[PDB]
Amino acid sequence: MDKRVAEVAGAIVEAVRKILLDKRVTEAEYRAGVDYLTEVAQTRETALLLDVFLNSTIIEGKAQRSRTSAPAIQGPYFLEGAPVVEGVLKTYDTDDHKPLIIRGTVRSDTGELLAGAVIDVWHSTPDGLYSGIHDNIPVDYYRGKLVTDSQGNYRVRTTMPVPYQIPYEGPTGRLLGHLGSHTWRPAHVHFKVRKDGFEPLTTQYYFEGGKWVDDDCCHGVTPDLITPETIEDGVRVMTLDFVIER
Amino acid sequence: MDKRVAEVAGAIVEAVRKILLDKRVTEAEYRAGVDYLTEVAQTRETALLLDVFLNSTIIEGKAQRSRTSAPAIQGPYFLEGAPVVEGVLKTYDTDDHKPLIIRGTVRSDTGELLAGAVIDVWHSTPDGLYSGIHDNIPVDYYRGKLVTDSQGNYRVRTTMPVPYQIPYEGPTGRLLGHLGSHTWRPAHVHFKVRKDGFEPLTTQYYFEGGKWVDDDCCHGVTPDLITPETIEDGVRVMTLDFVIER
Ligand SMILES: CCCCCCCCCCCCCCCCCC(=O)OC[C@H](COP(=O)(O)O)OC(=O)CCCCCCCCCCCCCCCCC
Ligand SMILES: CCCCCCCCCCCCCCCCCC(=O)OC[C@H](COP(=O)(O)O)OC(=O)CCCCCCCCCCCCCCCCC
Ligand SMILES: [Fe+3]
Ligand SMILES: [Fe+3]
Ligand SMILES: [Mg+2]
Ligand SMILES: [Mg+2]
Ligand SMILES: [Mg+2]
Ligand SMILES: [Mg+2]
């Protein structure tokens, strides 16, 4: 008997039953539903399907219960063991990459600039593929760790990310279809900031004006996480000042 | 956009989010939860897990919305293509089988005895295993089709079933563990009655006094589905009169 598992899991069970009754779900519908979720399970989409309708709500929760630079949903594509960089992120030399630059400061919720903070960054190849997770792509690519200096400053040069769709061929995709939504997410860059003394801050940031920023199939775009459009020497720039609490 | 999928699926999504907020589920809990359900998916327990907390409620629904001999949850172990029998069900000759006898009538909700109704029956080997689904067991065993005669009567001789537990080694088992329930179901026999003119009636029936009839881990035992204890010549007897609607 786990007090909390039994509080939260129970609350859900009790709550879904109600719907099963009120909406008057038939024997034949119930099968159709269960048959669906086994496909979802079969398709290894179990976590995905959850992430879409839920994870975004769970951020809205944490953002209420804490003081930090705006949080965002984490996403499936984070891999630990990213290489530390001065630096520049390792990216492919190819024509279709556009330079992106990321500057800023990591600091405490009490205001003190933190040094030796590790900023873990990952983002999509121009195709929408993440490294080491897609199509024979090296893991040291499009991933890296940034470490704030004596002033709590970090700067990194990298290629631009792109919007990508969650897998659209499966049960989740269509299910969104029936729900009048789509499979597309706006382009974003992934940050996880952890200082050995503080609570981890995981977030992603989008680009003002980018496609899908209005309609994110997951709901996890929020005004703060939209960066203004600023170029320097024809190089898109993100200036992000993180605040981790603790 | 499927009007109903979007009504019922939506209602659930909206309803689970509330819990995620109210109970104040953390980022770290959410993972733990999602991590759980992928195990459930990994363990091919996706349907099971649902059947336990839900399917029993879905009967309570149908039993409200229709006129029939009491319905019951279907269960995973029904296989179509059961052999028609006069008859007797094919069972193993072994010592530990106790004779069980099943008599009765199938009839319409308007009262007319139906003839040529097909009563599909399946039940557990003395071990708790179902045929063709367990341990190299022939499918013509512990399964059969009964066909009501000119009077709408059916009778079949068969071996006794036994209580069995839903798979207890996996994520569902323990999850019930945390919820203060168990893995055990009381002994029951499975009937599906379909006449080519009428709505299928699927139900199972338990034995008065049998273990677990009070505590069914799934909730799907109900007073009607408890048969009284009656022996004839030292042979347990079930007298069941089905009423299919339409
Ligand atoms: C194992 C849990 C996985 C995570 C669950 C997702 C978490 C939150 C989002 C889940 C969305 C709700 C799942 C409902 C899926 C319905 C599929 C469907 O309707 O197929 C359309 C279905 C067939 O089309 P399909 O989408 O290709 O399968 O439409 C039909 O023809 C039948 C009518 C469907 C109406 C059924 C209404 C919902 C009944 C489901 C009962 C079981 C719900 C248990 C889920 C509890 C969630 C905690
Ligand atoms: C894909 C859908 C499959 C069908 C879903 C089942 C349908 C109705 C029954 C579902 C029961 C609810 C599932 C919750 C499972 C919780 C697992 C757990 O707490 O592990 C204990 C977990 C670890 O132990 P474990 O059980 O071995 O994993 O306990 C912990 O240490 C962490 C605290 C757990 C508290 C989390 C509260 C629930 C958060 C889940 C958020 C996602 C819910 C989405 C489900 C929507 C359903 C429609
Ligand atoms: Fe991403
Ligand atoms: Fe059964
Ligand atoms: Mg600076
Ligand atoms: Mg600045
Ligand atoms: Mg008779
Ligand atoms: Mg009689």
Q: What is the DSSP string of A82-104?
A: PPB-SSB-B----TTPPEEEEEE
Euclidean distance between CA atoms B31 and A43, whole angstroms: 19
Widest pairwise Cα distance in chain B: 65
Residue B185 contacts residue B48 (beta carbons within 8 Å): no
CA angle A99, A101, A106 (to 5 degrees): 160
Contact A9 B178 (CB under 8 A): yes
Q: In what order do the strands lie in the sheet with B236-244?
A: B153-159, B99-108, B236-244
> Which positions in chain B touch A9 (Cβ < 8 Å)?
175, 178-179
- Which residues lie closer than 8 Å to B37 by C-beta, 6 or more apart? A46, A47, A50, B171
- Interface probe for A, chosen from B26, B30, B64, B172 (most Cβ of A below 10 Å), is B30
Q: Please name the fold of domain B1-246.
A: Protocatechuate 3,4-Dioxygenase, subunit A (2.60.130)
**Nearest atom, ligand 2, residue B12 CA:** 48
Task: Find the A58 Cα to ligand 6 centroid distance in Å.
Answer: 29
Residue B62 contacts residue A26 (beta carbons within 8 Å): yes
Q: Which residue among B29, B38, B202 places its CB closest to the CB of A46?
A: B38
Mapping DSSP to helix (H, G, I), strand (E, B) and coil, where does residue A32 land?
Answer: helix
Euclidean distance between CA atoms B71 and B242, whole angstroms: 10
Return the residue matching tokens 């809205």.
A60
Residue A182 is assigned to a ligand binding site: no
Between A and B, how many residue pairs show a Cβ–Cβ distance under 8 A?
148
Rounded to the nearest 5 percent, the helix, strand and coil shares of chain B are 25, 25, 45
Resolution (angstroms) stands at 3.4
Based on DSSP, count helices (H) and strands (E) in chain A, helices before strands: 5, 10
- Interface probe for A, chosen from B1, B14, B20 (most Cβ of A below 10 Å), is B20
**What part of B 152-191 touches A (C-beta under 8 Å)?**
175, 177-180
Mutate to test the pocket of ligand 1, among B1, B5, B35, B50 (most ligand atoms within 8 A of CB): B5
Residue A147 contacts residue A154 (beta carbons within 8 Å): yes
Q: CB-based contact (8 Å) between B27 and chain A?
A: yes
Task: Find the A153 Cα to ligand 6 centroid distance in Å.
Answer: 9
The Cα-based distances of B156 to A146, B31, B75, B132, B236 in angstroms read: 75, 52, 22, 21, 12
B139-149 in b/e form (b: 16+ CB < 10 A) is eebbbbbbebe
Residue B49 contacts residue B40 (beta carbons within 8 Å): yes
Q: CB-based contact (8 Å) between B46 and chain A?
A: yes
The Cα-based distances of B157 to B31, B93, B101, B103, B235 in angstroms read: 52, 13, 5, 9, 10
Distance from first CA to last CA of chain A, Å, rounded? 32
Euclidean distance between CA atoms B88 and B55, whole angstroms: 31
Euclidean distance between CA atoms B139 and B122, whole angstroms: 10
Euclidean distance between CA atoms A18 and A153, whole angstroms: 52
What are the phi and psi torsion angles at B114 (to 5°)?
-95, 140
Q: CB-based contact (8 Å) between A44 and chain B?
A: yes
Euclidean distance between CA atoms A108 and A114, whole angstroms: 6
CA angle B100, B101, B105 (to 5 degrees): 150
- Interface probe for A, chosen from B1, B2, B5 (most Cβ of A below 10 Å), is B5
C-alpha count within 13 angstroms, C-beta hemisphere, residue A222: 14
**Nearest atom, ligand 1, residue A33 CA:** 40
Euclidean distance between CA atoms A144 and A148, whole angstroms: 13
Strands B118-123 and B143-147: antiparallel
Rounded to the nearest 5 percent, the helix, strand and coil shares of chain A are 25, 25, 45
CA angle B83, B48, B23 (to 5 degrees): 160
Euclidean distance between CA atoms A37 and A224, whole angstroms: 35
Contact A9 B55 (CB under 8 A): no
Domain residue spans in chain A? Answer: 1-246
Contact B10 A179 (CB under 8 A): yes
> Which positions in chain B touch A10 (Cβ < 8 Å)?
179
Mapping DSSP to helix (H, G, I), strand (E, B) and coil, where does residue A40 land?
Answer: helix
Cis upstream peptide for A220 (omega within 30°): no
Mapping DSSP to helix (H, G, I), strand (E, B) and coil, where does residue B239 land?
Answer: strand
